[PDB]
C-alpha cells in the first residue's frame, strides 16, 4: 500500500518546492504544473525549445525521503483550447540533492511513453520504484513542437530511513540454466566487486518467491528477485553489509527475507551479528549483537528472518550473515526502528 498522491494536485507540495529550468512566460511557470489544475495558462512549458539537446526539466522537492512508485503526466488543457503536451520524457531523482541518478526500468529503458492529448492523465508504473527526495522530469521532443507538463507523484514516505547499503556484488550459480543473483537495479556505484553509495533490490519492497529461479516480473532472467552469494567465495564464512541511515535511530529489529530452497543450495543464514556506530567516533557503540537461528529448517519456502536489535541507538549498522548452506539468497532487508 504505497501509492498515495504526494501533493501536486493535492497542494501539500508548496510552490516553493516546484522549480524548473525555465518558463515560456509567467503564465506557464512551474507552479502551474499541478495535475488537473487550470492555474496560469494551463501548465508548465519550457522556455527554450527542447531541441536535440534534452536539458529542460521540471523539479519537485518532496522534502522527506519517499518511495515514489508512480507518476502521472498531463498536457496543457487550458479551458479546452490548449493543444500542447509532452509525448515522452526521462526521469532523474536524488536523495542528497547533490548526486542525481537517471531512472531506468528493469529492462534498461529510460524513456517513458507519455501523453497523447492535452486533457488525459497517463500513469506510469515505476518498476523499479525510486527512493527519492527530489524528482526531475525532462520533457522530451523529437521535432520542434512546444511541450508542456502537468505532473503528479504517487508513493509513500520512506520510513525505513535507509540511505544506502554496501555489499558484495551478486554472484551467479551455474545450474543447468545460469542463475543471476546480482543486484539488478542498484542505483549506486560498483567498483571492484563491491556495491556502495546506493540502494537496490534489497530495499525495493519486493519479496522473492520460494523457488528463486522463477520471478513475479516478466522478461527477466532466472534469479532476478534475489541477490545471492556463495560460501566458497568468502573464506570468512559470512557476507558483510553496512547500512547508513538518514538520522539517529533506536533499532528494534532487522528483517531479512531469505530463500531456503536447500535443494538447490539456498539455506537461511546460520546466524546474524550486527555492530552499531552512532556517527562521530571511529568506534562501535559496544559489543555486537549475535543472533543464532534455531536450526536449519525443513521446508524450502522463503521466510522472513527477524533479528532483535535491542533498541540500540545508532546511525550506522554493520551486519554479517553466516552461511548455513552453499549459498545465501536475500530478496529484501527491512529495518524496524524509531527516530530518537
Amino acid at each position, epitope marked *: 500500500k504505497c501509492r498515495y498522491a504526494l501533493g501536486m494536485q493535492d497542494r501539500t507540495i508548496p510552490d516553493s518546492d516546484i522549480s524548473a529550468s525555465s518558463s515560456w512566460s509567467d503564465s506557464t511557470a512551474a507552479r502551474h504544473s499541478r495535475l488537473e489544475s487550470s492555474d496560469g495558462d494551463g501548465a508548465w512549458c519550457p522556455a527554450g525549445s527542447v531541441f536535440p539537446k534534452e536539458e529542460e526539466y521540471l523539479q519537485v522537492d518532496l522534502q522527506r525521503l519517499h518511495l515514489v512508485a508512480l507518476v502521472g503526466t498531463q498536457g496543457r488543457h487550458a479551458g479546452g483550447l490548449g493543444k500542447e503536451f509532452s509525448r515522452s520524457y526521462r526521469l532523474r531523482y536524488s536523495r542528497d540533492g547533490r548526486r542525481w541518478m537517471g531512472w531506468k526500468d528493469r529492462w534498461g529503458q529510460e524513456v517513458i511513453s507519455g501523453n497523447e492529448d492535452p486533457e488525459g492523465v497517463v500513469l506510469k508504473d515505476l518498476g523499479p520504484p525510486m527512493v527519492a527526495r527530489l524528482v526531475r522530469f525532462y520533457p522530451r521532443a523529437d521535432r520542434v513542437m512546444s511541450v508542456c507538463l502537468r505532473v503528479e507523484l504517487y508513493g509513500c514516505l520512506w520510513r525505513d530511513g535507509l540511505l544506502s547499503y554496501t555489499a558484495p556484488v551478486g554472484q551467479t550459480m551455474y545450474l543447468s540454466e545460469a542463475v543471476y543473483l546480482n543486484d539488478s537495479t542498484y542505483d549506486g556505484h560498483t567498483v571492484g566487486g563491491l556495491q556502495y553509495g546506493g540502494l537496490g533490490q534489497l530495499a525495493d519492497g519486493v519479496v522473492g518467491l520460494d523457488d528463486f529461479r522463477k520471478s513475479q516480473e516478466l522478461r527477466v532472467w532466472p534469479g532476478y528477485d534475489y541477490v545471492g552469494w556463495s560460501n566458497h567465495s568468502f573464506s570468512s564464512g559470512y557476507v558483510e553489509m553496512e547500512f547508513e541511515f538518514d538520522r539517529l535511530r*533506536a533499532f*528494534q*529489529a532487522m528483517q531479512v527475507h531469505c530463500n531456503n530452497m536447500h535443494t538447490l543450495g539456498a539455506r537461511l543464514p546460520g546466524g546474524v551479528e550486527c555492530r552499531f556506530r552512532r556517527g562521530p567516533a571511529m568506534a562501535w*557503540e*559496544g*559489543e555486537p549483537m549475535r543472533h543464532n537461528l534455531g536450526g536449519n529448517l525443513g521446508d524450502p519456502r522463503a521466510r522472513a528472518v*527477524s533479528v*532483535p536489535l*535491542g*533498541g*540500540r*541507538v545508532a546511525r550506522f549498522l554493520q551486519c554479517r550473515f553466516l552461511f548455513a548452506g552453499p549459498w545465501l539468497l536475500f530478496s529484501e532487508i527491512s529495518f*524496524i526502528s524509531d527516530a*530518537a
Partner: antibody
Framework: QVQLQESGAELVRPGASVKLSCKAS????????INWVKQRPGQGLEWIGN????????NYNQKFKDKATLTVDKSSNTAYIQLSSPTSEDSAVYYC?????????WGQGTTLTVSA | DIQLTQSPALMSASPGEKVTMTCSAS?????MYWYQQKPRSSPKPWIY???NLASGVPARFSGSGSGTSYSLTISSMEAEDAATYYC?????????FGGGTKLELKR
C-alpha cells in the same frame, strides 16, 4: 546474571514525592533501555515509559506525562522513576524491565503504597 | 490508540490438549510479543518478534499471525502452562498490553 535489583516496598504519604530505584548489573548498562511497567494486584499491565542511559532519550506514556519522570545515574547503574503527587491509584507494583520490544529481563518489582 | 484484545479472556483446557489464544489489534503492528505471568510474580518474556521463543521457553509453544491478528499456540498443554498470558505491541506509543488470556487447567 542480568539483574535489575529493586526495593521490595516503598511507602509515602499522599501528595508527597516518591522515587523508586532499580540497580542493574551484568551487561553494559548505558546502551540498553530501562522500562517501567505498572500493575495493580490481579489487574493488567501498564507501560509507563522508558529511558536510554547513553543519550538520555526518553519515551513517556502520555497518561503519566505529568505524573512521572525517568532518570538514570549512569554511575551506579541505577534507573529512577519519579512520582510527583501520589494518590492511592498511584499505588501498586512497579516493575523496571530491560529491552525495546523484547523485554528480556524483569526486576522483582516494588510494591508502592500511598498511605498516611 | 492501538489497544489489543485477547480471546479467550479466560479459558481452561485438559492436559495434552492443543490450546491457542488470540491477540487482535485495533491497528496494524509489525510484531507482537507475549509474556507469561503467575500470581505474585514478575512476568517473563515468552515470545518476541511474533514467533521467537524466549530463553527457557519449552518447545510446546509457538506464536504467529500479522497485521492485526496474532496468536499463541501450545502444542501439548502441561500443568505448568497454567497462567495468564499478555500480548504486547511495540509499533506505537503507548506500547499497550492486551487484557490477558487467563489459562486454567483441567484435572
Amino acid at each position: 546474571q542480568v539483574q535489575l535489583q529493586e526495593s521490595g516496598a516503598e511507602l509515602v504519604r499522599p501528595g508527597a514525592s516518591v522515587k523508586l530505584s532499580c540497580k542493574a548489573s551484568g551487561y553494559t548498562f548505558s546502551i540498553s533501555w530501562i522500562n517501567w511497567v505498572k500493575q495493580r494486584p490481579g489487574q493488567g499491565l501498564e507501560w509507563i515509559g522508558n529511558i536510554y542511559p547513553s543519550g538520555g532519550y526518553t519515551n513517556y506514556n502520555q497518561k503519566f506525562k505529568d505524573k512521572a519522570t525517568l532518570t538514570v545515574d549512569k554511575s551506579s547503574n541505577t534507573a529512577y522513576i519519579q512520582l510527583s503527587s501520589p494518590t492511592s491509584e498511584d499505588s501498586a507494583v512497579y516493575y523496571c524491565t530491560r529491552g525495546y520490544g523484547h523485554l528480556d529481563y524483569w526486576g522483582q518489582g516494588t510494591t508502592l503504597t500511598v498511605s498516611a | 490508540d492501538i489497544q489489543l484484545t485477547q480471546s479467550p479472556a479466560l479459558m481452561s483446557a485438559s492436559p495434552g490438549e492443543k490450546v491457542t489464544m488470540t491477540c487482535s489489534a485495533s491497528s496494524s503492528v509489525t510484531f507482537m510479543y507475549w509474556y507469561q505471568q503467575k500470581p505474585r510474580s514478575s512476568p517473563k518474556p515468552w515470545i518476541y518478534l511474533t514467533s521467537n521463543l524466549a530463553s527457557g521457553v519449552p518447545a510446546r509453544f509457538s506464536g504467529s499471525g500479522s497485521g492485526t491478528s496474532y496468536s499463541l499456540t501450545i502444542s501439548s498443554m502441561e500443568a505448568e502452562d497454567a497462567a495468564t498470558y499478555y500480548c504486547q505491541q511495540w509499533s506505537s506509543n503507548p506500547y499497550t498490553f492486551g487484557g490477558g488470556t487467563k489459562l486454567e487447567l483441567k484435572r
